[PDB]
Amino acid sequence: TDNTFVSGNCDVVIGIVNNTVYDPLQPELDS
């Protein structure tokens, strides 16, 4: 998330690919 930002929708971009965006806040929930 730190290297990317959210814009538009997946049905807009032509040629978009699916993947998992790492969220540094998820592993911090264990602390």
Next chain:
Amino acid sequence: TDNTFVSGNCDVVIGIVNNTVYDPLQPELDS
């Protein structure tokens, strides 16, 4: 907070207006 940076105070800048700054870490506290 990602699109702005906190500096100075509210009594210096001329023409400052009041508003609310959304914090993405506030709603994540429930998890």
